Design a protein around this ligand. Structure first.
Ligand SMILES: N[C@H](Cc1cccc(Cl)c1)C(=O)N1CCN(C(=O)c2cc(F)ccc2F)CC1
Ligand SMILES: [K+]
Ligand SMILES: [K+]
Ligand SMILES: [Zn+2]
Length: 341
């Protein structure tokens, strides 16, 4: 079917006022619009999340605390609502792929905010999907460990979380080692792929394809939630991984072959123009459309200078991922997946 694109000018204007990502939502939407990708998609207005929908995960006391600390409660309800709307379109069979580039706030816990995440829209989207889909696979390709999502579903074998992230001393949130596998009946239903700085497209895709192939066979998912934070992209202030959207695009294309109901989320990404270049290219991957290298003129054309191209170039830095450590990591995951049925 035609992909669902979660959008309204009110939703974009609200997300533009977010702290460390000013005007990022407008930049992403206007680049997608400049490439005429919105014409190939079903524009769906996001509904604002009600107190009850947010309370499917968050405590009433924390939600009430969020109201008192606010305009953060309104941003939270709007983003959580946009993710719930994408899950609803998927539930209703309106589409096979539903996109909310302004979501993916993966660090937020039941009764505590963290890492700039005040509400876990991903958890809220997974819960709505569980209304029709028996098993959900959450895949997190953001530079950071999706700890809030993993923690939310740590006890259950009904939702499997897979996170590929930088895992190094003093690197936030500090969690997600290969030995972190969930608890109780959910033991071995949490997968963590610790990665070092300087990773490039080919090695990242080989790691990701290798884990997902094993995960898909052991878990047999009925729906997917995919978090695609652009903070892994070369040139990001995070200054860790050395990826391009071509590498992430391959992970995305591999997952799309499953032909399962897929909920697409954004995430981190502080180089604003590179984030928009990434998510625009990725929207082209979903639509199976190849984009012209030249950025078309639009409201934010000047932000793409001095090359004005969609392609991203890796930086001059070493790949700190030793081939023997990667195989030790993959072998340990294969050992864990022997307990997944
Ligand atoms: N993917 C995450 C969270 C996210 C998800 C969706 C959209 C956005 Cl815009 C951001 C991320 O990009 N972070 C959180 C952690 N970071 C921090 O500086 C940091 C923040 C803290 F509260 C404490 C210590 C820290 F070190 C770096 C930025
Ligand atoms: K991740
Ligand atoms: K789990
Ligand atoms: Zn991140």
């Amino acid at each position: 079917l035609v992909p669902v694109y979660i959008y309204s000018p009110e939703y974009v204007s609200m997300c533009d006022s977010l702290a460390k990502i000013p005007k990022r939502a407008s930049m992403v939407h206007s680049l997608i619009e400049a490439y005429a990708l919105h014409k190939q998609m079903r524009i769906v207005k996001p509904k604002v999340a009600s107190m009850e929908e947010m309370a499917t995960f968050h405590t009433d006391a924390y939600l009430q605390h969020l109201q008192k600390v606010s305009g953060i409660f309104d941003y939270a309800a709007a983003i959580g609502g946009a993710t719930i709307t994408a899950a609803q379109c998927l539930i209703d069979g309106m589409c096979k792929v539903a996109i909310n580039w302004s979501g993916g706030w993966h660090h937020a816990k039941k009764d505590e905010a963290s890492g700039f995440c005040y509400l876990n829209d991903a958890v809220l989207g997974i819960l709505r999907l569980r209304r029709k889909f028996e098993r959900i696979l959450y895949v997190d390709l953001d530079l950071h460990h999706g700890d809030g999502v993993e923690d939310a579903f740590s006890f259950t074998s009904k939702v499997m979380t897979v996170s590929l992230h930088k895992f190094s001393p003093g690197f936030f949130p500090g969690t997600g080692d290969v030995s972190d596998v969930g608890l109780g009946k959910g033991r071995y239903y949490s997968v963590n792929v610790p990665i070092q700085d300087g990773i490039q497209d080919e090695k990242y895709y080989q790691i990701c394809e290798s884990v997902l192939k094993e995960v898909y066979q052991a878990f047999n998912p009925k729906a997917v939630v995919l978090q695609l934070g652009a903070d892994t992209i070369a040139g990001d202030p995070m200054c860790s991984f050395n990826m391009t959207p071509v590498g992430i695009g391959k992970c995305l294309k591999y997952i799309l072959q499953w032909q399962l109901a897929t909920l697409i989320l954004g995430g981190g990404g502080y180089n604003l123009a590179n984030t928009a270049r990434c998510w625009t290219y990725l929207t082209g991957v979903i639509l199976g459309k190849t984009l012209s290298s030249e950025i078309p003129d639009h409201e934010f054309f000047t932000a793409y200078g001095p090359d004005y191209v969609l392609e991203i170039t890796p930086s001059c830095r070493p790949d700190r991922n030793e081939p023997h450590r990667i195989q030790q990591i993959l072998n340990y995951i294969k050992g864990n997946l022997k307990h997944v049925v």
